[PDB]
Amino acid sequence: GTSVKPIFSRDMNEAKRRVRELYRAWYREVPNTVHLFQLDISVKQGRDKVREMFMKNAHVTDPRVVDLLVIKGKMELEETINVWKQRTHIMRFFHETEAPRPTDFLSKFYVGHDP
Amino acid sequence: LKKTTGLVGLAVCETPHERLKILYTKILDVLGQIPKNAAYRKYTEQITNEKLGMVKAEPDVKKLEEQLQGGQIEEVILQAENELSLARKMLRWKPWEPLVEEPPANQWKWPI
Amino acid sequence: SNLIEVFVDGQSVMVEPGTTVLQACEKVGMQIPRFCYHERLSVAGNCRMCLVEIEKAPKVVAACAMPVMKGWNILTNSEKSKKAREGVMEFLLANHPLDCPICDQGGECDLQDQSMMFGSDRSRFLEGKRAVEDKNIGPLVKTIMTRCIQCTRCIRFASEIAGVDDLGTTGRGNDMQVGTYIEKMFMSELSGNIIDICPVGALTSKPYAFTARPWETRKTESIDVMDAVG
Amino acid sequence: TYKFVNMREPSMDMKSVTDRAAQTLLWTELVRGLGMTLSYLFREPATINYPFEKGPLSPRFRGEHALRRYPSGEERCIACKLCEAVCPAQAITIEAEPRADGSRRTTRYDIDMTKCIYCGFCQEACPVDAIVEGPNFEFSTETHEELLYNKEKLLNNGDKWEAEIAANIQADYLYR
Amino acid sequence: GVRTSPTGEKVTHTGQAYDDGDYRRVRFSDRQKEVNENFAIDLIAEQPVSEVGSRVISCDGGGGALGHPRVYINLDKETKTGTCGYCGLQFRQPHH
Amino acid sequence: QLIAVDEKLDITTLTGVPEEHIKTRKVRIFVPARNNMQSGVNNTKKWKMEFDTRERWENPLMGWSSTADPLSNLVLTFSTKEDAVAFAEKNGWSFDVEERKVPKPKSKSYGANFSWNKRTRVSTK
Amino acid sequence: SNLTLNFGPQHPAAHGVLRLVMELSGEMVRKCDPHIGLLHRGTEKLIEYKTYLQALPYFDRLDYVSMMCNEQAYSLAVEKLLNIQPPPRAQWIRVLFGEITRLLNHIMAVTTHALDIGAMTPFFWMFEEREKMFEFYERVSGARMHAAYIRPGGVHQDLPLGLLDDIYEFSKNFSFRIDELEEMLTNNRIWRNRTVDIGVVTAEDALNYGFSGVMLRGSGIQWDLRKTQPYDVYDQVEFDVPIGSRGDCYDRYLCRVEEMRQSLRIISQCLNKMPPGEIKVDDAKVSPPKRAEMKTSMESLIHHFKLYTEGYQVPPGATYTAIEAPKGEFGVYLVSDGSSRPYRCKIKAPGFAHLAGLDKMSKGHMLADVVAIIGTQDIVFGEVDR
Amino acid sequence: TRPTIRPRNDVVHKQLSAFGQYVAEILPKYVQQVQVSCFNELEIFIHPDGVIPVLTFLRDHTNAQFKSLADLTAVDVPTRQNRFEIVYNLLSLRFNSRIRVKTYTDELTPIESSVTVYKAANWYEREIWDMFGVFFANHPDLRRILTDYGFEGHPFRKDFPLSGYVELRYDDEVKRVVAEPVELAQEFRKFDLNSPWEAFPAYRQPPE
Amino acid sequence: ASATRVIQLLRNWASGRDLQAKLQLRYQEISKRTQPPPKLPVGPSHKLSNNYYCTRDGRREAMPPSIVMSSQKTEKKAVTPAPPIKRWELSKDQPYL
């Protein structure tokens, strides 16, 4: 029951199919992105980052949430392909000027009060 | 007779009486396929019948325009076509049925 | 059972015998304006801000002291109630000093808020104002007596809650004043509470003076550790 | 009630046709435009000799902020914080305490001039005419930090501009 | 009422001067420190106390609508003087 | 057409909040206490959701109050505690709820001020 | 493949921070994709954190060429929600300064349109007049453009003691300046070639796409909000509404010039009909009292304190208030939850719909024609992005 | 009651009430509520499924003729189970009137795009999607319109912080503009202005 | 203004109008920069009697919207939102530009 209306997919199988299609499109786009934006990363780095972004949301079990995630990923792909994005936008995925924040207890205790 | 309807993209109508009669007959024909107890059907039939009677009773275009209160009979023709299209859509939609769903108890409560 | 039915603005409610009009209005969620009534002090009835109209009664009653009668119909928003509140606010503000920018009560003033909500927006008072000398009741409670509206909350709290009979009123009429009449320190372990219950800037915190305004403060609800009461 | 801007028909008599042909071939309206520019060439330009000549201003003009004093030399500000509450940009920062003589005075009074929108709401809100927007507008700095005013800077502005600020207030306070 | 700290820095009306080990003093090197020289506490302390023949006096800071809100000061205490809470002017009754 | 989704509602991956501000945060759901300086009760009617207090420090220039907490100002208003709990749950925030505290009904009696033999008699009025 | 070109934001013809991504075959425009948001400042959320008086200066900065018209729309919305009424003299002042503002906006629009086209001279002639009107703004409020004069209770201050005479002196010379502008542009064959039959929109399309103002009236639609849904004292002034015939850039230019003339007419009427009286609503729980009262009376001081710290509370409810701003219908959807801060403020700007229709209006045109169409839509991106 | 109080108009109130009754009778399938505000502003609450029919009827009906869409926006009310309130404002030139149509949705439920009914909606629906995250079904080209490229979250939502989560600055080591977690030199100072005394008795809620 | 009369004649001929009659620079006909003080009339609520605020309270007369046709709860002639607009008149001042 729970009486919900879908966006595109009726169960997780169709949602997974759409996820795979979007992943294929991003995988094909990465080399062109590296060429056009004149990025100093490799194609391997770009595809690894695409996989990491996809795996960030691997725990989702709602087909509607997956449909919205695919819609957002398609929005980002359309944005990248048309060059609406600049090199700064593409490089924002890699956080190159962010100092690594530690995760163990002792370093956090040393730096400050935040957990 | 008249040049320059005055609205861009609205051509002057030659023989507007015949066009209006044809359009109103088509509108009534479409309304005939709606359940008789539906409010849309009776309201649209009433207004269409008044407009058709006005068109039939007034051979003069400017006097008919002043009677119809519809602003420059070419616009009356356009509105008749719009009503015909809406009538077909309403036939497909059937909005006279009972309310589809009832909203949550505090959905329209304001403030908060 | 023993409940009696009364009406607040034409709406039925069941109340215990001896319940005041103010509490019955509170049952339906309406707050009667007040200055001298405190639900933890003994009823005084002096401020006269709580006057309300009972249907088919020519005289407004004091809601904080009058017990509801069976079948009564309070009318909290009638013209008579509104005019009573406006007149009482006018008499309250007649001699009040123009002290809001320098008063610590500034954004937390019951007098200010009830003037904005129930009083008029103007003055027709064309006389001079009264001024009274300040009292010194110790290092904790700052005293600016001109601001006093003579609610007598401090006197009732000190006598009944704190157990001290140091506060009182000397003189009578317009010149009546709240104080100790002698140089005395109102020193007790519950003294600072007279700052909270005083509705105006007559009694303020001396350590807190001038440091902050209420709208800029952030509120953190917490517990005290100075003793074992928590 | 309406009029038409482009519903005029041209005359078709031989004289009108010949006049329009002369307009087309001999470029009469273009010479009209040339005449208009030539006319403007011989007018006096509306330029002013800045900085020697200044643009006109008003007593209500909103400029650089200043903190004022009473004629005794005592500051007018009593730290009511109404200016800080009303400021739509949150450009005002105030800290206060009792002075050594028990007076209610500020210990911090900052205006961030790069947050300020120069609306004048603070001088309306001030109940003792302590904070004003003075007449000055030529205070461009070379660094961002010079535009973060503290109480000393604002008191110095008041001391420097009081003569003109009081004369501006005298000319406008009856409209306030 | 200006006065310098042991470091040579002027002390403001507020009383804040950077401490000897405070690095923030570096912001003044090759530049200056803004200090207003007219101390209000000292200037108001020079005004003479006004003697009035009434128990209650009124103050509006002078200038009518150009001063502060009008307030009334009680002058019954003879051990002190009545001080305006807005302007700082002092009032007393003729004593002794 | 309806598809009968079976799982609990969860929208964290769509809100765009960085994960640090989803997992390490604690919200408080409560009816705010009446300000003891006043008698009005109009600010004690609705439920509030607010986040935990984070570090504030002093700006080296001007000595302003600096923060690095983006949720230090966010306050949400709800009709009922259930709505607040549902919002916090679907947004993935750990929450602490406090039951609403109401003043107890008190028996007032003006005449008790003048008791013949009771302790309630007022020594002054 | 079509050539893909960035038009702006750093372009003279852009008229602000617009990134017009254009697909072109030669110089023919195959597709227009306006990318906006380069001036989105998040104004509506900010307005949610302010009181109703603190949110007023935002409406100055929405459309920075029609400041008081933006202020008037917001003030009307708040006054409707407060169930109060501005005094008559305030309403006459509002209409007078709204017409002065319409003059300012129309000068800016026409001269910047001519400057894009290539006729650079009329800009300098008309900006001296704009300067004098800025002086009028400054005398009344102390600010040249972001005045914040119109408030939800009326106006902030009464006019200074010699302003009407100077407004009269300015108004009796402006028609000759309009005449010189028309001599420069109206009958020039080059200007007509650059404007006639460019960006033609039909009445039906203009209505459906959400157009308003001149973009309607150039296509023959007879609609002016001052005539159909009057506000303030617009029902007491007489003026004509210019109407076009062809729906092109040339017709829109003529409409704006004639609108400028009709504004002069309305200003003349407002000057001769200004009544006496107070300038804000005589209700100190909404409008602040005078300073002398604030310094003498206890109630006045309490109300001044509360109005400047907390602000007035607005009874709960939502309104959509619209005015005939110089660029079209300008609206506010204002939602009050009962407190002194607005719960929601949605701003309706005509430039939003006009720019959304720019792609439709540029079909079958070249690059220069697209520049002319952007000029003829009268776009300011403060109101588009907000 | 005369000089400072806004005057009433009962004729327009009656006309709008009658027309609201008209609309409700014609479309019972979708119309849930009809209201006429005190300042004469007709409001019609409907079911989401009836977005396209209602609007179509309202723009096409001879007695309606609301051919122009003033604006379309959304309101976020977190306490409601359906978070978002979709508001359409329509103007009729033939009858010189205005009407407001309101519906509701939540985070995961699409609304039918009304570009077919009104061409003006395109950018309005894009803006609602960008600011609030409400998806519109069958929309021609749905994408962000106001926010920056790659911006995560929806700013207009009540939960979103006023200053957001990231800021921008130019970094010389990478020679480009970078996005980093927001740090503020001065924190925005939250004010508590709401008065503890009730202002409007007419809107008092039952004590539950 | 101040210029040679021959230049004024050339200006008038080129522009086609008498330029001197409507000069665009303000020479001396504008208001003085110093004015007498004003007096400013008070409002209608400045009465000393019969001025109770409850009789001039516009905020307190606002009420929640009137509910028509709650779903939760004869010929019947059709109706419109408002009467049709009257057609506009053609500007007896100047109908055609």
Ligand code: SF4
């Ligand atoms: S007690 Fe209240 S009314 Fe009196 S001066 Fe202080 S803030 Fe103003």
Ligand code: SF4
């Ligand atoms: S000091 Fe305060 S509590 Fe005591 S009588 Fe005066 S107003 Fe009441």
Ligand code: SF4
């Ligand atoms: S002028 Fe406006 S923005 Fe600037 S400090 Fe004053 S109130 Fe704030």
Ligand code: SF4
């Ligand atoms: S400047 Fe004026 S408003 Fe601001 S704190 Fe000082 S006295 Fe108050």
Ligand code: FES
């Ligand atoms: S509260 Fe009842 S008399 Fe004071």
Ligand SMILES: [Mg+2]
């Ligand atoms: Mg107190």
Ligand SMILES: [Zn+2]
């Ligand atoms: Zn004084």
